[PDB]
Symmetry: D2
Subunit: 106 residues, 4 copies
Amino acid sequence: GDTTITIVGNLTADPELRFTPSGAAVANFTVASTPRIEALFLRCNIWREAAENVAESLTRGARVIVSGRLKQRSFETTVIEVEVDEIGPSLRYATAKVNKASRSGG
Amino acid sequence: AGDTTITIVGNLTADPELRFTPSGAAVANFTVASTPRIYDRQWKDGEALFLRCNIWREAAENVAESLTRGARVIVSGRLKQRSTVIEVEVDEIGPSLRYATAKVNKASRS
Amino acid sequence: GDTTITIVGNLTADPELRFTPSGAAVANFTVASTPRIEALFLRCNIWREAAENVAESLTRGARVIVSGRLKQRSFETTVIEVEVDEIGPSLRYATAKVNKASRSGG
Amino acid sequence: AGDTTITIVGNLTADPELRFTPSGAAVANFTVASTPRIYDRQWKDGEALFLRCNIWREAAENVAESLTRGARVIVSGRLKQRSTVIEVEVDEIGPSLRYATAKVNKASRS
């Protein structure tokens, strides 16, 4: 089958960044969202430069909009997790100066 | 504040389950098995995830009556952290009309 | 970019079916959904056997759940339309007898 | 009854627009241009669609201030048929952190 998800919440901590043996960047963070009618924490993952952009521009307590797919993996005493497709900061209660980086294809 | 809605397409892995609450409310439980297709390289179709869902009210019974193990369903809902344990609070569920057909009933008789 | 959508509503008319010169089946119908806090009509499209399944099993006034992508096309005096990924009938106010068809790969 | 929510990723095509209502409410208007990728055959990336969106309240101004033509945004919302004409009633919007970076402000000063 398939599964996509969109989440709006606040960062719990700041995006922790780490690089892979291959060189590929992997940001990491967890979005906490409390619906109105609670408390749900979703840990997300991002790759490639978008990983570095996140770690570089976001901080704990930031309101974000996330679209991605679900994922699970085993831990030792399976938990759901989110594969980020694209992430941005909400302008619902904030503003932001945006600086794109040019080089379209790659 | 920020919410979290989700749409899932997968299979049931078992017949639903009618868990009547102590208060007297119907609740159907099932888990949607979904393994996505990943157009890469040429594995091109793998990484199965199992999502535990909880449908409430009237639909808890329509689901327990209509759906069965191996069923391809389309689920709409939200992720709740109540109850490890994040589950899908199903808002709408329906037998996918892909690969299958169905005869629909209604609201008002028998 | 990209865009996915999920709709829950009722059929306005019955799925109209038609075949293509290539032989590919194309069902067609439009879902009317009125949110609670209105009246929005979305015309959908489906292909392959799922098209025939729809026309064969659904009827006007039926509550359905639809996931797909948006699409637009010009008409003469552009309108948004939905490319159905998968459609099923809601069990929120109904029940259904399901008869899968076997032949997994194709 | 049945609702309809949607998530869009695309570009703005122009700077937003502050359309203050007669009542006195802020409203920002823009249209998200989105052309999806379609892994088929080997066109493998085409069919551009343009979605007109309307963001309201406080965010109408934060958007008009923060975003500009050519911007890659992530939009969350619902399709409304008010005003041909189906538009996106934006609930949340944000500059996509893919291909770009951003400096976030907040709620309470200056």
